[PDB]
């Protein structure tokens, strides 16, 4: 379909200066899958927000603090979000990393969507469903298996026509779809669509998607244009893996290290 | 008002040699806001004290130890301080980071103020109130929103005349006021007033104020002149952010890293 | 016996490219010996797997997360494995590091062996026993004392004829035996046998065997040939200690650092 | 008294090669003072032992594991040692860092002294007492205030004649005394006495003594001559502070960093 790449030149032209930067909400991490909250939290705080509130399970909080003492907490927030509309205003919200694929998580999604801000759905928050007309984009970040869960398009078919399917479903759902893989597709509901040119096989390991979700969350808080936030996050996330492989084997990357590398990588694009 | 900058030359002339160094008390961190205690604790121990006692909530202690095993503890100290005068002597005391804005915290402030040492109030310990005549300076570290809470001066007005307001209120309250922002103002109750020339937008993220409070606390323990301690802490805290941005994006700094950078930055001024 | 060395040339010829990478199961760590799970987990995730599930004791989970937030968990998995066959499919399984030498651990071994994948037994999972005919190699990683436990060959005798004993018992048991020591022996049940040429005395400290077990586990997930996975893991584990001693005393290595060094060492062999 | 310095030439001549290395027991860390166990544990494992068992309070264990996953544990060991003789054999034992100054700690000291190995007493294990004739040296590591507690020699008097007092009391008690300060004195019960030439004011902060105790413990496990172990530990501990101050301010060192620096410093003396 000749989908263009979001190139270095586009990144440089669109990344913000740091001369407020928003407050983000991260609804992530469960007793059974705690690490996703730390990964997404580090990605978000590394990515230019002003404040982060992590609504994680109570028993997950103590696992984050020593690594990310800059985050604050909404105790059992992802569970509380199932029961009522948020009362605080956030610049952007992410939900899903480390959450189970349950109806209660979808109830929290429904409540989060009544806020007027960009919302990211990932992992356990991804389901076959439709989305309400609202202010603010909804950004879905499926791996191909999650895309199958969302759409019924089998993975072996999806992978032959990734951009065509991503574009079709972004239009049908009226959501942004970041369809992960080699050459991640970023499809917008208005029909714009891009391929990401960065990254390598070092990213094909658990946790790298949690880091990406956090990076998007933070970038939404420092870019005025949420489209550029999404594109720049996907781009820089892959550029971190590429920097890693200059001196380290691609087999050996741990996701949290992408966050650790981002400071230097981002500097290069300023 | 032509407020002078506290310059490199002033810093070099006033930083102490390490040829006792005091015991500090840090009353910080609550179950709901734990990270502030780790941030302020690292800042304090990095800043030239001899010993640190952290009076944090019992459930916060285990979150600090693996990162800062050099600190010792007064279990639930900030809560116990509400009920009685301190029995141990400290070289300096800080109260507030990660504490709620409650009457019980003000009761602890009242008790801490009966000690004969410099005392720093930050975050939850900042309120609209007056201060008793005592030995030792009281040092307030408000962001503009906290200054509004203290004084009723709205933020949009404050920000047009920052040094004039800081100076006026330092005189009226007879406290030191470190009014944070770009060009942080350091106003003394005797009418001396300075602007800080260091820092950048990397500091505009949660946790950097907790780190600063700790840095002031530690510097009070190694400088004979508490005025120089405050000025040097504010200066070096900003100089750490500047060093960071040489090779890292200003969007990507985490507060704890200021503490990690301070060793090298301080060396340059010796 | 003229056993050949698995040399650099063999390593280079056999290490995989990262152009799925498997899901591994690690059954390790107990309340009394928790650290082995973190060591083996880091080794495994550093070594090219796609996903890691750690079946550790419930109280050990929170000790791993802040260091390795990329792992997921099967709560009390090593204990649950005593009662039933695994229902999920894994590319490879390791059992033993930090587990007690008990009958219940052997019950878990028996159940794990009904899976169709390579299985590694280490530490508490090593016992005097025989092994069922199955699909997938069984890989034993004894120190000489554990070899004595397995075979009744006293250590002072073993150490005079290490490769002869390792070869004899690999044949008799029909298992791979990685007999650790200076010049670790890798003996296969088909009679192939190699010596490892890398390593030094820095490895003669607690925890380095836990790291090795993890490294083998991960390498089994990215090599098509499990024999090459075992050989390359033993080789690279020793090569990490050698890199360490270039600028650091051999007395001072901590096992987890082998995992930290592996990224750079592996790169050199690509 | 013309006490000689233990110089670089002596260190080089006496440090061991790493071509067993012993199992050490560390009885340290209490709920109220947990960090000392992590500091002493890191120092010990960094210092050439083969295995470390940490007998700390149950609630302190989880605080050590993520930082030092190579250690194993004797749960509530320092408390259990009050009730009975040790049943396991250790190459060396340390007791005291982070322990209260109580009779129960002295009961544990009494029991530990029935073992046939070098024993180090520090911090809460230091008291006014005498010592039984035994195999293995007893090594006391007092700061001047602890020396006052041990002997009744006031600090202001002690500090005028440090080596004379240390020598006199080492002879009277028949213990090694490492009397800390600038120019730490190492006095042996046979009348040998040395001054340490390394170190600086960076060491005058909480936790550095816990690190030293651990370093001595580990060095006792890799030196055949326990006198050289003590001397080399004190020397290298100070040499780590000196390396630190080359690029970092002496005000800013954290004790755990001495352990982190030791690998490189030790290499220089090989
Ligand atoms: O998430 P999930 O797909 O619902 O369930 P899983 O537990 O299988 O996957 C968890 C993580 O491991 C990754 N993953 C799972 N199996 C994998 C495989 N063997 N190879 C590479 N990555 C794998 C997933 O991409 C996911 O990473 P992310 O959460 O950071 O996006
Ligand atoms: O503290 P507080 O002002 O009482 O309450 P908040 O939870 O909103 O602020 C917590 C921290 O986030 C910072 N902060 C809050 N919102 C922010 C915004 N969106 N942009 C930049 N920084 C912000 C505050 O400065 C504070 O940092 P500090 O505690 O280290 O001084
Ligand atoms: O394991 P184990 O042999 O059953 O029991 P131990 O507690 O004595 O050994 C635990 C670890 O310390 C190591 N070890 C024990 N004593 C040792 C000694 N004093 N010197 C060197 N290493 C030693 C073992 O090799 C083992 O390391 P690994 O688990 O990473 O393979
Ligand atoms: O130990 P202690 O002397 O019984 O009691 P304290 O709590 O006062 O001291 C704890 C630590 O802080 C250190 N310390 C206490 N006050 C100090 C001071 N203000 N300046 C420098 N160091 C100090 C002690 O040397 C000790 O360090 P170490 O445990 O690593 O040897």
Curated annotation (Swiss-Prot), chains A, B, C, D:
It comes from the Bacteria. Keywords: ATP-binding, Lyase, NAD, NADP, Nucleotide-binding. Its cofactor is Mg(2+). Homotetramer. Gene3D superfamilies: 3.40.1190.20. CDD domains: YXKO-related. Pfam families: Carb_kinase (PF01256). It catalyses: (6S)-NADHX + ADP = AMP + phosphate + NADH + H(+); (6S)-NADPHX + ADP = AMP + phosphate + NADPH + H(+). This is ADP-dependent (S)-NAD(P)H-hydrate dehydratase. AMP binds at residues 180-184, 209. The gene is nnrD. It comes from Bacillus subtilis (strain 168).
């Amino acid at each position: 379909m000749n989908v263009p790449f979001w190139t270095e030149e586009h990144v440089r032209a669109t990344l913000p200066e740091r001369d407020t930067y928003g407050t983000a909400l991260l609804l992530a991490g469960s007793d059974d899958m705690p690490g996703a909250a730390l990964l997404a939290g580090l990605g978000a705080m590394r990515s230019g927000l002003g404040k982060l509130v992590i609504g994680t399970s109570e028993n997950v909080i103590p696992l984050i603090v020593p690594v990310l003492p800059e985050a604050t907490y909404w105790r059992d927030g992802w569970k509380k979000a199932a029961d009522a509309q948020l009362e605080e205003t956030y610049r952007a919200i992410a939900i899903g990393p480390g959450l189970p694929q349950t109806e209660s998580v979808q109830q929290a999604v429904d409540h989060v969507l009544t806020a007027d801000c960009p919302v990211i759905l990932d992992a356990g928050a991804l389901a076959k469903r439709t989305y309400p007309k609202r202010e603010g984009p909804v950004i879905l970040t499926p791996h191909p298996g999650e895309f199958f869960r969302m759409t019924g398009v089998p993975v072996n078919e999806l992978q032959k026509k990734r951009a065509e399917y991503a574009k079709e479903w972004a239009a049908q759902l009226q959501t942004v779809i970041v369809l992960k893989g080699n050459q991640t597709v970023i499809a917008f509901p208005d029909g714009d669509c891009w391929l990401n040119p960065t990254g390598n096989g070092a990213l094909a390991k658990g946790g790298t998607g949690d880091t990406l979700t956090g990076m998007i969350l933070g970038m939404l808080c420092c870019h005025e244009d949420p489209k550029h936030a999404v594109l720049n996050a996907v781009y820089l996330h892959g550029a971190c893996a590429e920097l890693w492989t200059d001196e380290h084997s691609a087999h050996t990357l741990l996701a949290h290290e992408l966050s650790d590398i981002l400071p230097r990588v981002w500097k290069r694009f300023e």
